[PDB]
Amino acid sequence: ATDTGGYAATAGGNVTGAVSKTATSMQDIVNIIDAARLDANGKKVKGGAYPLVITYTGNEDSLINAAAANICGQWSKDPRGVEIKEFTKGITIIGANGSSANFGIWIKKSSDVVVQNMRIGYLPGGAKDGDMIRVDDSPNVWVDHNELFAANHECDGTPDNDTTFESAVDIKGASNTVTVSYNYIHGVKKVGLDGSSSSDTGRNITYHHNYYNDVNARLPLQRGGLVHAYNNLYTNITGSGLNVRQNGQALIENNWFEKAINPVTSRYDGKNFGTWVLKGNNITKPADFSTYSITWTADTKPYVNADSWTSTGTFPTVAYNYSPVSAQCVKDKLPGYAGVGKNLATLTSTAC
Ligand SMILES: [Ca+2]
Known part of the structure; x- marks a missing residue:
């Protein structure tokens, strides 16, 4: 289908x-x-x-x-x-x-x-x-x-x-509808753009069931548009995670964050902050930050962190059909469904 x-x-x-x-x-x-x-x-x-x-x-x-x-x-x-x-x-x-x-x-x-x-890794030509x-x-x-x-x-x-x-995965231009799922991304400094510039705003992109480990930033670096991130497992994020910019909207649900610095932000522009809707993640209130090693930092210019862990905007009715498993199930099971050699296996509630 x-x-x-x-x-x-x-x-x-x-x-x-x-x-x-x-x-x-x-x-x-x-x-x-x-x-x-x-x-x-x-x-x-x-x-x-x-x-x-x-x-x-x-x-x-x-x-x-x-x-x-x-x-x-x-x-x-x-x-x-x-x-x-x-x-x-x-x-x-x-x-x-x-x-x-x-x-x-x-x-x-x-x-x-x-x-x-x-399975793609250690590519040459980073400067080109x-x-x-x-x-x-x-x-x-x-x-x-x-x-x-x-x-x-x-x-x-x-x-x-x-x-x-x-x-790892850069998206830009009129790439209006994209799905990035079940990927095992690790040891990557710049994960991927979603808009190559301030003017390159838009697109509707979904990131689901991805396993990120030891990544520095851009999960993604969103420039406007909509981003729906569900059932991802984010760990060992050494810089920042979802960076919602240029009034982009994001629905961040049922993901698992652990050992991450600035998991959800809007920084580097100093203006036109994006919004996010938080729901069913392993983190539910600021108390959980200490529980999962979530730290926050400030930026030299005006920024917005999700340190209150509250929804700061809205999100349109998610067009497609999807069945997210719980945050725990992702943490427990996702590593076995993400990546190569998993015969394209998907994570369901029954598997939880
Ligand atoms: Ca590039």
Whole structure:
């Protein structure tokens, strides 16, 4: 079906007439997508000729392990990534169990794209937009059951001292409806934007059942629009979590926060603070902060923290259908449903 448990409604390339192809390498993925633009007469078709389901069986563990050992040598290398540009027939890139990639997936001006069961880590090119997953001007995209990692560390002498490694999942432009679910993101400094600038506001994005561990900031850095974050497990957040900016609205429900600094804020602009609706999280009142090691800090410019742990605005009726489990169930069970090799398993109340 087209249900993603979020704003994105897609089946990807898992539709009628889909052509199934197996990619053994990054280059195969590129050659496969390219060939999919040609019709029966060998002539290009705008948006692609047919739907695709690409099963990636490649393994680049040697690159990953080599990079994991020399963290500071990555930012200056050439970035590596597969570009899914202007492909709208529907496409699904799914990793075979045991596969891995030291390259990213950059989606641009496309639609109905599903990325599943991919293990991407320690990407090169942090100083040259070496994102793991980029969703740009692309509606109906589903980023599900992936493991995205690097090192939550900033080396010295990197451009802007913020380029050791780029982001895990950056969303920007007219990527109007996106669902980011069941991903295991760890060891990442900049998790992901939701608007590339003050002017790039909007979109409806859902983050659910994601497991974040040892991440510094941007969970996401929201620029306007709506963000619905439910059933996520946030732990070891070393900087800030959800940063709601430019009057964006967020519904933060049934998540589990632990060992986090500034879990819900609106900072760095000094104005146009966003709002949030808090409900059913493990934290219910300020008393719980001490219980789960939640600390807050101030900013040099005007900011708004959720230290009173109260709702500061409203949120529209959540269009889609979804069944959130309790905050405890997430904390207990989520680590077994998030990531690669979980056969795309989902967490339900019955499993609680
Ligand atoms: Ca980026």
